[PDB]
């Protein structure tokens, strides 16, 4: 409203540059209502498309990443780029700026291999597995013996 407040504690021009004690409104006409800016505080950042999708990716250019494909890859979906350090291997050293998939990524943070194979009946494989499972280090390819062949093809303990 023109020179008036929302509640009306102060209503003319004499005090034109001051704000209301209980509610906040400094006034000149509703033009201030059309010129002022508000902002939204983003949870986890996102990026300007004006800079990311212009032909020369101003960010792909500056940051040596795949100028057009490495961005789209990590940006909108979950394709990870090791940022500072990541000691453990893929087969080669930590990729300073290279990107990896969910799968291989998954293979990394829990432990090398996840193998949950649960037996069919109550007596055949439940026995083979149990006998060699609790304290015995089971080597790769541990051939559990009963339904078909329960194959444990990976590392250390069980």
């Amino acid at each position: 409203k023109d020179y008036e407040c929302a509640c009306g504690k102060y209503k003319r021009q004499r005090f034109e540059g001051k704000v209301c004690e209980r509610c906040g409104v400094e006034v000149t006409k509703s033009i201030v209502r059309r010129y002022r800016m508000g902002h939204i505080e983003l949870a986890t950042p996102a990026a300007h498309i004006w800079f990311v999708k212009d032909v020369p990716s101003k960010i792909g250019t500056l940051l040596d990443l795949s100028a057009t494909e490495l961005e789209q890859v990590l940006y909108f979906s979950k394709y990870i780029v090791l940022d500072p350090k990541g000691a453990i291997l893929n087969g080669v050293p930590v990729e300073k700026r290279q990107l990896l998939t969910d799968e291989e990524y998954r293979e990394l943070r829990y432990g090398k291999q996840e193998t949950y194979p649960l037996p069919p009946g109550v007596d055949a494989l439940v026995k083979d597995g149990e006998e060699v499972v609790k304290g015995q280090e089971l080597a790769p390819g541990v051939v559990s013996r009963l339904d078909g062949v329960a194959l444990y093809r990976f590392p250390r303990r069980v």
């Binding site: 209502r33 983003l42 986890t44 940006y75 453990i88």
Partner: protein, 158 residues
């Protein structure tokens, strides 16, 4: 530490089974894995454009035309950034300016029909998603759902 995250030696995760004194110790390490503007915001802050300028200077005049040409185009953006004007960490968005109100009116048409600048439907998009994000983090956070939203959020910001 209990049975989630614990770094002892090169091996870095520790599960615990109070049955037998068994301290399960999984082997992968701190792998900084990130995807989304988060990862790029980081990358952008870490670069000392002076270094890459000098680096490109050498890459520009010395090797053959293929990698030096790419370096000339990549030196353009870096130079202006440094030259005069502002520095490059800003390209990332974490604070979204909102256009004034009276510029995205809400008006009384006919019958009581109302008329609003299309901008407001997009703004609500962002706000709802931004909010839903915050509540989704707080409530507890299943990865897939958090990204899922961060995706939508991004798209919205576009």
């Amino acid at each position: 530490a209990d049975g989630g995250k614990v770094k002892s030696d090169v091996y870095g995760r520790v599960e615990v089974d109070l049955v037998r004194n068994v301290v399960r110790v999984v082997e992968s390490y701190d792998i900084d894995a990130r995807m989304g503007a988060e990862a790029i915001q980081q990358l952008l802050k870490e670069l000392d454009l002076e270094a890459l300028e000098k680096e490109l200077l050498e890459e520009m005049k010395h090797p053959s035309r293929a990698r030096r040409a790419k370096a000339r185009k990549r030196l353009e953006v870096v130079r202006a950034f440094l030259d005069s004007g502002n520095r490059p960490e800003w390209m990332i968005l974490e604070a979204v300016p909102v256009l004034p109100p009276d510029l995205r009116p809400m008006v009384q048409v006919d019958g009581g029909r109302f008329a609003t600048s299309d901008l407001n439907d997009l703004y609500r998009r962002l706000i709802n998603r931004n909010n839903r994000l915050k509540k989704l983090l707080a409530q507890g956070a299943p990865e897939i759902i958090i990204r899922n939203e961060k995706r939508m959020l991004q798209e919205a910001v576009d």
